[PDB]
Amino acid sequence: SQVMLLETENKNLKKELKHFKQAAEKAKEDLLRTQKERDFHRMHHKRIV
Amino acid sequence: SQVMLLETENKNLKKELKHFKQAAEKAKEDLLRTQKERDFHRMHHKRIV
Amino acid sequence: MREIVHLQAGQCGNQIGAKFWEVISDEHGIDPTGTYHGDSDLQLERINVYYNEATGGKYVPRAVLVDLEPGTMDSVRSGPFGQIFRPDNFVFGQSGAGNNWAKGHYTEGAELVDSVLDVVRKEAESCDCLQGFQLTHSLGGGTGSGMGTLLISKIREEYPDRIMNTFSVVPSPKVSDTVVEPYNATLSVHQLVENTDETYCIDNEALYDICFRTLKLTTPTYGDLNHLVSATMSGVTTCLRFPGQLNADLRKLAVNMVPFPRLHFFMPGFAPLTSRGSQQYRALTVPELTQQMFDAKNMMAACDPRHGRYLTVAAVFRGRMSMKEVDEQMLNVQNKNSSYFVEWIPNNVKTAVCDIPPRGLKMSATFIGNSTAIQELFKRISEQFTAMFRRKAFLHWYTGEGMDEMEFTEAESNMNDLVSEYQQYQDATAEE
Amino acid sequence: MREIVHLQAGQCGNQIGAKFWEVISDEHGIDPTGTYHGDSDLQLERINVYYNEATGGKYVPRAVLVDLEPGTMDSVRSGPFGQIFRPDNFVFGQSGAGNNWAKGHYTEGAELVDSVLDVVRKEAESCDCLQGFQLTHSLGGGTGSGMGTLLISKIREEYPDRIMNTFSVVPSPKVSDTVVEPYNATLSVHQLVENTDETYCIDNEALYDICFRTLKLTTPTYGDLNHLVSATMSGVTTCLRFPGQLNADLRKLAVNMVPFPRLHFFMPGFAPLTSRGSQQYRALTVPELTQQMFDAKNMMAACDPRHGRYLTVAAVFRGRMSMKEVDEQMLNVQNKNSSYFVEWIPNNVKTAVCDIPPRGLKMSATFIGNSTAIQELFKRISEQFTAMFRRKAFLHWYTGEGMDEMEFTEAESNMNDLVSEYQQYQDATAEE
Amino acid sequence: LKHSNKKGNAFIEHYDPKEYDPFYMSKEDPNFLKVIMPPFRDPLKKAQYDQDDEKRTLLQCETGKIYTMKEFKEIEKAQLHSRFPSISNSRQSMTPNGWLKVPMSYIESEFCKKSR
């Protein structure tokens, strides 16, 4: 049980860190893309008004 | 010794997990505000049309 | 003066309209002959809304029946009240729609459309000033759905300043009648969200469950559902038919109940649904009616409003009770059931009581509100449409009619945008 | 205002409840139709406690019948007063309990429980403010025993601020009906001592002996026992139904009568139990009523209160005599019979007189006491449970339902703790 | 032909859980006449799948356990069931064969049953 817990925790937490890193980079890319859309969409709506 | 080393690993693994939770939540509220702006902006354009 | 022009489409629409006309005729004291046999007071002043003044006091209905199959007019004419309408309004074609929307709109929607436009115009100019047009139809077929959208679009283009209210029937995967029904629904929702003021959601499976579990009927049929929907619409329009203390109208409800034009769907409902053996043992009061208008058991949806948040609520009453009980009831409801309505918008319940009681019943109140429950219908419709459109089954008919396939693409794109909008407004957070 | 909601469970519970309803309708003056035919004064003011105001003055019962077998419904409806109740409250399943507690609690207590919670919550909300809930059931079966504990737990969790009184039927080794009765009793007692305010002990063998040796009946049947218990509860509840001079209520009794929450059982009883030929030869006076409320012969217990010491006593009278004789009688009883009550607690008898006489009888008085006599029943239940559980007979039936055997271990452990507590409080010495 | 001749007066409506259950053609190899469907990268479905994956990743971050599209589906099904509205008295969850055999389907009034 000692060993089994050791490797189980190791693998679980490693994959947790990896997936959290993937989520963080995805989220930052999403926010950048959104704010660019923000700016150009501002210009579009103002000019058409 | 194996147990102490692996617990010393687990603590920082969970710490990094929590920090990434904070980062992800911040990015998600940024996404939320950007999406609200998406919505009223595209409403403005459909009304314009 | 202020009159409403009624429109008909689809065999189900035709039969429900006939049932509604019979119900209102019986309520307002009209014999099947065409004369007047009423004994009330408010049944003479505002009677002209749905009728027309004629010689001998013989009032005539104001409704145009649009269909493609001649078999419908013979059926609806043979009834006890089928001899009172205007046979001119029965504009029928020679070929059937075959439950096809594209074919019905294209083939049977070009040469036959002119006559119904002519008659609806002649009716409009026959009167001085009008408010709107009521069209009751169903999306189950090419008759109601094929031409209802086209006629609504045409009347909107002609007279933009009119009420586009309708009571189309929503489909159900559990209880289906047409193989290509999802395609027709996808084609219809685009026009309903692009060129329609407001629309109410009607389901037959939910009404069947309601009657089975509360009315306890031996052999429930379409006649019962027609009676229920007729009572529903009668309660809807009594705000204008029978004025009382706090009178309302259709445009006021449309403006106050629709936060965004893209979302104009509603949730109708009537409160007193009891069994035959329970009609002699009941307590007529405010809290009971409040519970029946608030619980999801009495509602006529095949979904659950508790899955989302209440957006807009209108409680139309028809009787002589009070005003204080209604406001205290809605107040305590908003206080206790705080996790069921949008917190960002207080006081989402509207007050409306009709001092004029209906005929035959002393207490009645209908429920008109727009809750967050149609999202599941929309999402499942989109899913089934995507599943069907992936490999293009049952498409060669529409293709051979002439219309291309990009219409399906843009319709599903609109559907995805609509569901995304609905879901992101469902969780209407106060701030970040 | 202050109303009481009544609950029903078990076929025996169903029939005793129906007999109680018939008795109270007869004495308050209610015709079998549903109208009012009484001629009294207080029978209209506080009549709403058990009834509900409706149109035409037709009061309705307030009782929810819970059962697992539809055979009880037809039996109870065919009676002369079975057409007055609410058929909606008769929530019945399709499969019988089989006199199994675990199986009924698991299978027949999941998909049917929602309806009874819905109806009871509607009943609770229909009123302004309540006091408690009355449930009449028996431990002899899986219907009353399996479901009553669950319902009591649910109503306690939802509404902790209410009264939970019950008149469950204790078993008897001499007169039994179920083979696995010890198991059901052991499972019921844990819930009765953990999630129940108070519980009244009901035995059939003692009632049969009382009627046989005092009433001297020809063919005493269950109807007689139901009438007796109906009179018992009527005398219990008259403190609130009919106000007199010294009115009491359920919670005041439950607080002043119960020294410790783990001991909430009592000993009910009615004084004037005379034969048919003795009715015209009797002296209606205080000391006679005192002697019949003090002696164990009139007591409906299948044990002997003389084996222990009296803990708490309350004499609820109903009639027009006075106070002084009651207090002097209890004083001289405490003086003479000093070795029958706890010396550490003086004045263990509570006085309660109802000035309003019952209908059909002029002098009446019930006995509610908690004497040291149930310890024998508890220990015999414990020993028979231990004998059953030693070799694990009749256990595969409960095992196959899914629940384990450990529950029995903790139930018997709780039983041993309770009996030890009872015996070491039986010899409540003054000091070392 | 062999079955029709041996049993003589036999059709293929004579179906029962027997060793001769001609459906056993398919049981030998379910993959026969079957095509593997790995998770594809269809952009049409991906238009919603990206949003679904964003929601799943947000939930995983808030919880801290890897979830797949299926695993996500079951966890929100479970949280909706535990959210309280399970709907156990309406056609949103009940089986088709759970309405005909209902006391509410006994419209024949309890008066005759009282007579019985």
Side-chain angles (χ1 to χ4, degrees):
Chain A
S1 61
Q2 292 73 60
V3 170
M4 183 278 288
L5 272 298
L6 302 178
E7 277 87 8
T8 309
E9 295 168 357
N10 292 314
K11 159 68 179 55
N12 291 341
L13 298 184
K14 297 301 184 294
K15 61 91 176 178
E16 286 302 321
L17 295 177
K18 267 64 176 182
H19 295 89
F20 275 55
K21 292 187 287 290
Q22 302 153 8
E25 55 88 13
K26 162 69 171 176
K28 64 97 186 177
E29 173 69 285
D30 296 329
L31 69 87
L32 299 176
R33 297 297 192 76
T34 52
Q35 67 196 23
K36 190 266 181 181
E37 186 160 11
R38 263 185 182 203
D39 290 326
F40 72 69
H41 205 296
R42 261 66 167 177
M43 280 76 76
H44 295 105
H45 88 290
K46 293 195 310 300
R47 67 185 68 188
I48 314 182
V49 174
Chain B
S1 302
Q2 187 176 7
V3 169
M4 61 79 71
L5 187 145
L6 291 169
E7 291 179 353
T8 316
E9 291 181 356
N10 293 324
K11 51 164 64 62
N12 61 63
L13 290 148
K14 287 186 297 300
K15 175 261 296 180
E16 298 293 338
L17 282 182
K18 271 75 173 177
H19 152 66
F20 264 51
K21 294 176 180 59
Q22 309 156 5
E25 75 199 15
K26 167 193 58 58
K28 86 186 173 56
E29 294 103 17
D30 303 330
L31 287 182
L32 289 180
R33 59 181 177 93
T34 54
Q35 283 173 342
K36 298 173 184 59
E37 286 148 83
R38 300 319 148 201
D39 304 330
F40 67 76
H41 271 314
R42 58 197 70 257
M43 190 85 158
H44 293 122
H45 293 89
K46 62 177 291 298
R47 172 76 273 180
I48 293 175
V49 171
Chain C
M1 191 55 267
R2 311 298 290 186
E3 300 183 0
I4 301 301
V5 179
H6 197 93
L7 276 299
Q8 289 298 287
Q11 58 87 29
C12 179
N14 297 333
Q15 63 183 2
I16 66 179
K19 189 65 172 61
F20 170 78
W21 277 100
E22 292 179 357
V23 161
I24 62 183
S25 307
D26 295 330
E27 287 175 357
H28 306 74
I30 294 95
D31 61 339
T33 300
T35 57
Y36 181 76
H37 285 59
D39 210 344
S40 176
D41 304 333
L42 278 82
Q43 290 181 354
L44 189 151
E45 180 184 359
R46 293 294 184 264
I47 191 167
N48 46 15
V49 176
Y50 292 157
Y51 291 150
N52 180 24
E53 181 70 24
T55 179
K58 299 173 296 183
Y59 298 93
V60 296
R62 183 182 302 269
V64 178
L65 188 153
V66 185
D67 62 330
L68 302 180
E69 184 64 25
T72 62
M73 61 95 88
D74 282 324
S75 61
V76 304
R77 187 182 299 271
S78 302
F81 295 86
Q83 71 282 350
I84 203 182
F85 294 93
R86 170 74 273 180
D88 190 359
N89 295 15
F90 294 80
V91 182
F92 54 94
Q94 300 289 339
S95 174
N99 300 303
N100 189 315
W101 185 91
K103 176 177 57 182
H105 178 249
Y106 182 76
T107 301
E108 290 82 11
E111 65 279 14
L112 198 62
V113 70
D114 312 326
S115 302
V116 297
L117 276 69
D118 299 330
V119 305
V120 298
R121 287 194 297 274
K122 86 194 181 189
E123 295 294 335
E125 291 102 19
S126 62
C127 180
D128 181 15
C129 181
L130 299 173
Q131 305 178 347
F133 301 87
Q134 175 51 53
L135 170 64
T136 59
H137 65 269
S138 62
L139 310 184
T143 52
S145 177
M147 284 73 74
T149 61
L150 178 57
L151 69 90
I152 290 299
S153 60
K154 189 63 171 68
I155 192 61
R156 294 177 65 88
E157 186 270 346
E158 296 179 358
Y159 297 152
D161 53 328
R162 299 297 170 85
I163 315 176
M164 295 298 103
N165 52 328
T166 179
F167 290 84
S168 62
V169 180
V170 298
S172 178
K174 274 72 56 177
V175 180
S176 178
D177 201 13
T178 308
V179 183
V180 296
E181 179 69 24
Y183 290 157
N184 306 330
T186 308
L187 293 176
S188 58
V189 298
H190 180 65
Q191 273 61 24
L192 286 181
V193 305
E194 288 299 331
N195 300 327
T196 303
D197 303 357
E198 60 177 357
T199 298
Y200 300 90
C201 302
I202 302 299
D203 178 76
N204 292 320
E205 181 178 0
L207 289 177
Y208 166 78
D209 189 15
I210 285 182
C211 75
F212 181 76
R213 77 183 171 179
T214 59
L215 279 76
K216 305 169 181 54
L217 302 181
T218 63
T219 61
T221 59
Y222 292 155
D224 299 325
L225 282 75
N226 296 13
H227 186 198
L228 270 295
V229 302
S230 306
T232 302
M233 270 85 80
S234 305
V236 167
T237 58
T238 187
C239 64
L240 290 179
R241 178 59 190 95
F242 293 149
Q245 198 276 338
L246 181 56
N247 62 91
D249 65 291
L250 276 299
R251 295 292 297 273
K252 173 55 180 56
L253 299 176
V255 169
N256 195 269
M257 294 299 291
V258 173
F260 302 96
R262 52 180 170 270
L263 296 190
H264 54 68
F265 295 89
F266 300 103
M267 183 64 206
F270 190 59
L273 277 297
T274 62
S275 64
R276 180 37 45 191
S278 55
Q279 295 292 338
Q280 299 296 333
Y281 311 96
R282 60 176 192 257
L284 279 299
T285 187
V286 182
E288 286 197 9
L289 296 179
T290 303
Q291 295 304 326
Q292 274 85 72
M293 60 83 78
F294 183 75
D295 71 326
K297 184 182 60 182
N298 191 89
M299 79 191 294
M300 41 76 68
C303 49
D304 187 12
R306 280 79 56 88
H307 298 173
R309 304 179 62 89
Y310 301 152
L311 307 177
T312 56
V313 180
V316 181
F317 300 86
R318 185 174 178 177
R320 184 189 296 105
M321 312 85 78
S322 185
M323 73 292 291
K324 182 175 68 65
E325 280 68 15
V326 190
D327 62 64
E328 66 87 10
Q329 280 291 341
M330 65 183 73
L331 175 59
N332 57 67
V333 174
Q334 293 182 176
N335 298 329
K336 63 177 179 285
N337 294 96
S338 180
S339 300
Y340 294 86
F341 65 96
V342 288
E343 59 86 23
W344 189 256
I345 299 95
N347 306 120
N348 304 265
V349 183
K350 182 184 179 182
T351 67
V353 179
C354 173
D355 302 2
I356 303 300
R359 182 60 178 87
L361 187 49
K362 190 260 293 181
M363 294 299 291
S364 301
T366 183
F367 182 88
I368 301 299
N370 185 24
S371 173
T372 307
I374 58 184
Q375 44 90 13
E376 62 86 20
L377 295 85
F378 279 108
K379 292 278 320 182
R380 72 189 181 187
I381 285 175
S382 178
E383 187 275 332
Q384 61 189 359
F385 182 81
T386 306
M388 301 325 188
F389 195 73
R390 193 198 65 82
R391 207 186 288 180
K392 290 171 173 41
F394 306 94
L395 196 59
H396 68 277
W397 295 101
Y398 292 165
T399 313
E401 292 301 325
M403 298 311 90
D404 47 2
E405 70 284 350
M406 311 335 287
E407 294 180 354
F408 302 90
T409 69
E410 64 180 1
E412 64 87 15
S413 179
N414 295 131
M415 192 56 268
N416 297 14
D417 181 70
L418 286 179
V419 296
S420 179
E421 175 267 341
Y422 202 92
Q423 68 90 11
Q424 189 274 331
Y425 287 165
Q426 180 269 351
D427 55 346
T429 178
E431 294 85 4
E432 60 178 357
Chain D
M1 61 79 71
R2 314 298 297 183
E3 297 186 359
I4 299 303
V5 178
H6 197 287
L7 277 296
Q8 282 300 105
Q11 61 85 30
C12 185
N14 298 331
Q15 63 184 1
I16 66 179
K19 190 62 172 60
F20 173 80
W21 306 133
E22 291 177 357
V23 163
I24 66 175
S25 302
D26 290 331
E27 50 84 22
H28 290 123
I30 297 89
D31 62 339
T33 300
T35 60
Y36 181 79
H37 283 60
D39 291 324
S40 177
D41 310 331
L42 281 81
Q43 288 180 351
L44 188 153
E45 181 181 359
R46 289 297 186 269
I47 192 167
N48 48 14
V49 175
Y50 293 159
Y51 294 150
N52 188 24
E53 174 68 25
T55 178
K58 298 178 298 181
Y59 302 93
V60 295
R62 185 178 302 269
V64 178
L65 185 134
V66 188
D67 56 325
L68 304 180
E69 183 67 23
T72 64
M73 184 151 159
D74 292 323
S75 60
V76 303
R77 185 179 296 273
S78 301
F81 296 86
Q83 72 280 350
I84 200 182
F85 293 94
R86 167 76 274 180
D88 293 331
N89 295 15
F90 293 80
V91 181
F92 61 99
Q94 298 291 157
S95 64
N99 284 6
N100 186 315
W101 186 95
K103 175 179 57 183
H105 181 246
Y106 182 76
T107 298
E108 292 77 14
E111 294 78 10
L112 200 62
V113 67
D114 308 329
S115 303
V116 298
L117 281 71
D118 297 329
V119 303
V120 301
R121 75 185 62 252
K122 181 179 181 179
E123 292 289 337
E125 299 297 326
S126 59
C127 179
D128 70 335
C129 182
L130 302 170
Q131 306 174 351
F133 300 87
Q134 173 57 57
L135 167 59
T136 60
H137 66 268
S138 64
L139 311 183
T143 54
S145 178
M147 295 298 102
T149 62
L150 188 66
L151 268 298
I152 288 300
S153 62
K154 295 293 180 288
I155 195 61
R156 184 168 192 161
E157 188 268 348
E158 294 182 358
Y159 293 153
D161 54 329
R162 298 296 168 84
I163 310 175
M164 294 182 286
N165 52 323
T166 177
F167 293 82
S168 62
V169 176
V170 297
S172 178
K174 274 72 57 176
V175 181
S176 177
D177 288 335
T178 307
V179 184
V180 296
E181 183 71 23
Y183 293 156
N184 301 334
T186 312
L187 295 178
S188 59
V189 65
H190 182 62
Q191 273 59 25
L192 288 180
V193 305
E194 291 297 333
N195 299 328
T196 298
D197 289 350
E198 61 178 357
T199 298
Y200 298 90
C201 303
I202 304 300
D203 178 74
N204 64 7
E205 182 177 359
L207 292 175
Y208 164 73
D209 189 15
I210 284 181
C211 77
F212 180 81
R213 75 183 170 182
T214 59
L215 279 75
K216 298 178 180 58
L217 308 179
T218 60
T219 177
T221 58
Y222 291 156
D224 298 324
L225 280 76
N226 298 13
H227 185 201
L228 268 295
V229 302
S230 307
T232 302
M233 277 81 77
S234 302
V236 166
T237 56
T238 191
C239 60
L240 289 177
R241 178 58 187 93
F242 293 154
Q245 197 283 331
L246 187 56
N247 64 92
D249 83 336
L250 199 45
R251 54 97 184 173
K252 173 52 182 54
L253 300 176
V255 169
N256 192 89
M257 202 56 177
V258 174
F260 301 93
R262 49 191 173 277
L263 297 191
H264 61 71
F265 299 88
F266 305 107
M267 162 56 198
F270 187 56
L273 277 300
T274 59
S275 63
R276 293 187 295 271
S278 56
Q279 303 294 153
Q280 62 284 58
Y281 293 100
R282 183 67 275 166
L284 277 297
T285 186
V286 179
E288 287 197 9
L289 297 182
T290 303
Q291 291 297 150
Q292 281 75 246
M293 61 79 71
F294 182 76
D295 70 328
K297 183 179 60 181
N298 194 2
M299 295 298 102
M300 61 79 71
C303 45
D304 188 11
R306 278 81 62 90
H307 297 173
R309 307 177 62 88
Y310 299 150
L311 306 177
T312 59
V313 181
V316 182
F317 299 89
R318 188 174 178 177
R320 184 190 301 101
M321 182 278 288
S322 195
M323 282 95 77
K324 185 174 71 67
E325 275 56 29
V326 183
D327 58 65
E328 69 87 10
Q329 278 294 340
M330 295 299 102
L331 178 59
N332 58 66
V333 170
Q334 292 181 175
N335 299 329
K336 301 177 182 179
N337 298 89
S338 181
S339 299
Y340 295 89
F341 67 96
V342 296
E343 60 87 22
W344 189 68
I345 303 106
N347 304 120
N348 299 262
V349 186
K350 180 183 180 180
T351 61
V353 170
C354 174
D355 305 2
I356 300 301
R359 181 60 177 87
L361 187 48
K362 185 261 291 182
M363 293 297 102
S364 300
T366 180
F367 180 87
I368 301 302
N370 185 25
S371 173
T372 304
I374 200 67
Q375 57 90 34
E376 175 182 0
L377 293 86
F378 272 105
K379 73 169 58 59
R380 72 186 182 185
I381 287 172
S382 179
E383 60 84 19
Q384 64 190 0
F385 182 76
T386 309
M388 295 299 102
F389 198 69
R390 195 198 64 83
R391 206 182 288 184
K392 300 182 177 58
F394 304 94
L395 199 57
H396 72 276
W397 289 104
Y398 293 152
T399 310
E401 298 300 327
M403 276 75 92
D404 49 6
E405 73 291 344
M406 167 258 284
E407 302 182 4
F408 302 91
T409 71
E410 275 82 15
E412 59 87 16
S413 179
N414 293 133
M415 178 48 55
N416 295 123
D417 176 72
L418 289 180
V419 298
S420 178
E421 176 265 340
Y422 202 90
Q423 65 89 13
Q424 61 84 29
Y425 291 169
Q426 182 271 349
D427 51 354
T429 62
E431 55 181 355
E432 63 174 357
Chain E
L1 290 186
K2 284 182 302 182
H3 174 59
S4 303
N5 297 17
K6 187 173 185 176
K7 202 172 175 180
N9 298 332
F11 314 117
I12 200 151
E13 185 199 278
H14 296 104
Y15 79 98
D16 202 76
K18 263 59 186 173
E19 192 274 331
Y20 181 67
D21 179 18
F23 183 76
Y24 59 87
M25 294 297 102
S26 58
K27 292 183 174 180
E28 302 165 6
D29 187 11
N31 310 271
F32 182 76
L33 300 181
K34 183 180 176 181
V35 164
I36 190 65
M37 320 285 188
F40 309 104
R41 190 47 181 76
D42 187 5
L44 183 147
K45 298 184 176 182
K46 256 283 190 174
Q48 188 67 26
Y49 182 76
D50 282 349
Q51 294 179 356
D52 302 331
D53 174 68
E54 287 169 350
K55 301 177 182 180
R56 181 184 60 84
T57 47
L58 289 178
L59 187 49
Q60 167 171 357
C61 291
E62 296 296 331
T63 61
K65 182 171 301 304
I66 185 62
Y67 306 133
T68 69
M69 284 73 74
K70 278 76 64 180
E71 300 181 34
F72 185 70
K73 293 305 132 187
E74 294 84 4
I75 66 184
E76 74 254 9
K77 287 193 289 292
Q79 68 183 358
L80 286 179
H81 202 316
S82 60
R83 201 261 308 262
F84 292 165
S86 177
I87 299 96
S88 58
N89 189 359
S90 180
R91 313 193 100 92
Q92 282 72 23
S93 66
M94 294 183 286
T95 184
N97 48 331
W99 290 293
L100 306 180
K101 196 181 176 182
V102 168
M104 301 325 88
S105 61
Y106 293 97
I107 304 97
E108 176 262 309
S109 60
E110 285 78 12
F111 287 171
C112 303
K113 309 171 186 174
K114 285 165 66 176
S115 70
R116 301 181 195 96

